[PDB]
Ligand code: CHL
Ligand code: CHL
Ligand code: CHL
């Protein structure tokens with residue numbers, strides 16, 4: 001289970017006939033889904049697993065960072081804007097971007113300062129991830145460990161193989177939910193919890209089909 | 220490959236005479252080989268098998284789609300009372316008052332709920348798209364693209380000389396329909412009318428009702 | 441008790457008061473001469489005694505009962521759900537086409553053309569088979585659960601279930617025929 005041919009596939013019983021031969025079941029999250037054939041070269045397939053996991057980890061920090069200012073504005077905490085896709089505009093406000101609501105907090109004023117900080121900061125860390133450096137040199141670029149496993153959970157590879165599967169499946173949900181969040185922000189214009197609440201008001205009437213006539217062309 | 224004129228080294232190619240030598244993996248073996256792989260996307264002979272079985276499924280859906288987008292607008296011009304005869308407005312028929320009438324006829328299908336349509340479709344497509352992958356009632360172990368048997372009841376694939384000829388006709392009808400269904404997409408986004416309306420508007424005045432009428436249409440500011 | 445039955449058959453009983461499925465002998469008479477250019481024309485002689493359809497009769501009960509089981513089960517529930525008598529269908533469907541209260545778009549003239557193509561061609565394909573056990577019991581799509589892998593030729597019984605229900609469904613529709621015009 002989860003490795004070898006005992007793994008469950010992406011079509012269930014329908015994928016028993018045809019999975020790609022190179023998707024043997026020696027990597028986490030392998031359900032044998034390469035119907036486009038984009039990874040029959042194993043060097044490219046080694047590159048794509050890095051792309052999938054880094055997209056998965058940024059989507060997990062994304063889907064939590066998009067869900068937390070809305071769930072805390074529902075409690076009653078005053079925010080400049082709860083929704084994530086209007087959450088960059090607070091640095092152009094009057095008082096600037098306060099973190100929750102206070103003034104002893106961050107209190108961002110200049111967008112050129114906070115971006116040029118990020119560019120040199122993520123310029124170092126992402127280059128360290130591609131090469132190696134002050135937190136590891138010869139480590140695995142997929143899963144380094146050591147200083148990136150402080151709590152001692154990257155041990156006993158029978159339960160560390162399962163944590164690899166728990167890593168990517170939580171991520172593949174989160175990537176599908178950021179592209180979730182991306183589309184439902186464009187099509188509706190309201191927040192994802194704001195889309196969650198009015199789907200709970202009337203589920204039959206308020207769904208995705210209520211906005212199906214929106215992008216129609218008419219000149 | 221036989222001496223079938225569409226196969227092998229002396230086959231017609233996508234720049235005619237200006238094409239030179241085709242790529243080394245396009246040996247004239249599989250149908251519709253005009254030697255057009257300039258991006259090199261199918262240099263891997265395993266991805267090239269996936270792209271072949273992804274082109275033809277796109278081709279067979281777009282051949283149904285291009286016939287399926289002309290036909291309600293062609294009959295709609297001839298007085299058949301569709302709710303929306305135009306294809307890209309044909310989804311919104313479920314949202315009007317009387318529902319969705321096949322052929323504009325109220326005592327035909329009369330769909331009222333779009334969630335019943337999608338719930339039926341996911342169950343029925345998911346059963347048969349999986350049958351295309353493996354097994355199934357109409358054929359268990361067959362070819363992935365050309366299964367035949369129950370999907371060739373007229374026997375039009377018996378002669379493998381004829382069958383290799385008709386596969387070229389299938390892919391050229393398919394690539395024409397994919398290229399035209401992409402035309403349906405773009406010239407509905409740009410113009411906003413049906414493709415048979417765009418045809419009859421072009422035929423009424425080809426000098427002004429070409430695509431350069433809408434060239435300044437997406438101009439910024 | 442009859443002797444020409446009771447074996448390899450669902451209804452292994454000699455019910456016959458008259459023996460309709462009795463294999464009878466036959467004798468062939470010659471053709472009488474009718475040539476005028478002969479002086480005398482004789483009445484033909486006995487030529488050939490012939491030793492001699494239970495397979496044909498088994499098929500024909502099965503077809504009638506299965507149409508009856510579509511008829512008896514179809515007349516009780518169309519009387520229940522719709523609320524119209526089974527004899528009245530046709531008088532109310534010529535006026536307005538319906539199924540379970542849902543209006544249908546078909547003229548009554550089209551129903552003749554629909555039924556003689558669809559039901560007719562399926563009846564043209566049933567007699568396109570030349571094996572009397574396959575004519576009675578075909579395979580293929582009509583056994584989707586694959587019960588032909590089982591056996592009923594021994595004492596184990598896995599077939600005599602439609603044919604008893606075929607019998608009284610013919611009778612209960614015969615009871616519908618004695619009830620329609622009279623009562
Ligand atoms: C046998 C039943 C079964 C079926 C039908 C599926 C189906 C699917 N699984 Mg699988 N699974 C099944 C069993 C199982 N799956 C899984 C575990 C997984 C995982 C982890 C994943 C899948 C995924 C998928 C999808 C991959 C193929 C695809 O992308 O289609 C694409 C085509 C469609 C989905 C059809 C199109 C949608 C719709 C019907 C049309 C609507 C049209 C719109 C209105 C168009 C409008 C657009 C406008 C703008 C033009 C597909 C929906 C993957 C996925 O989620 O990707 C989607 C995925 O990550 N499955 C397990 C546990 C091991 C199963 C157990 O039996
Ligand atoms: C010898 C002359 C000859 C020439 C010049 C071509 C040229 C072409 N053939 Mg070939 N063929 C030729 C002979 C033959 N072809 C074929 C059989 C085929 C087939 C089956 C196919 C082709 C296709 C193609 C195209 C392939 C590459 C491409 O897409 O260009 C890319 C570059 C362009 C298309 C230039 C762009 C045109 C225009 C000037 C730009 C317009 C500018 C817009 C205003 C900008 C838009 C604005 C923005 C903002 C939106 C190309 C147009 C393929 C095709 O149709 O794909 C489209 C194709 O499927 N040919 C046969 C029979 C054997 C030939 C016989 O001699
Ligand atoms: C073949 C797949 C497919 C495509 C291309 C469409 C396309 C469309 N549907 Mg639609 N549908 C499709 C399947 C289905 N639809 C519906 C049910 C509906 C309803 C109820 C409605 C629509 C509407 C629309 C139109 C939205 C207007 C618009 O966005 O303008 C911009 C886009 C275009 C002008 C065309 C460009 C097409 C597209 C961007 C490119 C196609 C490639 C896609 C990215 C592939 C996506 C398919 C995936 C899921 C496999 C749009 C043309 C609405 C409508 O009719 O509004 C007037 C509407 O109300 N659809 C069902 C049943 C659940 C489908 C089943 O598969």
Ligand code: CLA
Nearest residue numbers: 057060061143144145146148149153154163164166167170
């Ligand atoms: C729920 C998602 C999830 C899961 C199951 C895993 C699982 C794993 N990761 Mg991955 N990872 C993830 C998300 C996840 N990771 C994300 C989002 C990042 C980016 C920050 C990373 C970055 C990362 C690195 C760099 C490394 C791992 C490693 C590991 C392994 C051991 C550590 C472990 O068991 O953590 C299990 C994790 C959990 C049970 C989640 C706990 C819940 C947290 C606290 C949620 C709260 C988030 C917090 C509020 C936001 C702060 C974010 C901040 C840290 C940036 C194991 C395969 C290490 C490894 O394999 O060593 C060889 C390793 O080197 N991961």
Ligand code: CLA
Nearest residue numbers: 283284286287290291301303304309320321322323327328
């Ligand atoms: C890619 C394939 C494709 C797709 C997705 C669509 C999608 C669509 N078509 Mg198009 N169409 C296509 C190909 C396609 N078409 C082709 C190839 C043709 C040419 C034959 C047509 C001709 C066509 C017409 C003429 C109409 C549509 C309509 C529709 C819409 C409703 C679908 C529907 O009613 O299905 C359900 C359809 C069926 C199940 C098949 C038809 C069944 C009819 C009702 C006869 C009933 C069968 C039987 C004789 C009676 C049974 C009796 C019963 C009591 C048991 C939808 C937008 C309708 C619309 O309003 O769009 C504008 C419409 O009227 N289509």
Ligand SMILES: CC1=C[C@H](O)CC(C)(C)[C@H]1/C=C/C(C)=C/C=C/C(C)=C/C=C/C=C(C)/C=C/C=C(C)/C=C/C1=C(C)C[C@H](O)CC1(C)C
Nearest residue numbers: 033034035036037055058059062065066084087175178179
């Ligand atoms: C598998 C396969 C197979 C075959 O063969 C082929 C194909 C089909 C191609 C394939 C598929 C694929 C896919 C599905 C893909 C997808 C992806 C995604 C979705 C991603 C995302 C991804 C996503 C992501 C990263 C995301 C991220 C995010 C983030 C960071 C966020 C951030 C933020 C926050 C916090 C909040 C604030 O206020 C703002 C912001 C700034 C907004």
Ligand SMILES: CC1=C[C@H](O)CC(C)(C)[C@H]1/C=C/C(C)=C/C=C/C(C)=C/C=C/C=C(C)/C=C/C=C(C)/C=C/C1=C(C)C[C@H](O)CC1(C)C
Nearest residue numbers: 255256257258259277280281284287288306309397400401
């Ligand atoms: C070859 C090559 C080579 C080099 O190297 C590179 C490159 C260049 C990349 C390449 C190329 C490619 C291409 C050309 C592509 C294209 C494609 C397409 C267009 C597809 C379509 C495709 C398309 C398709 C599928 C389509 C389909 C469709 C359909 C179904 C439809 C449907 C419908 C109908 C009926 C009606 C209604 O009312 C609506 C709807 C719903 C809408």
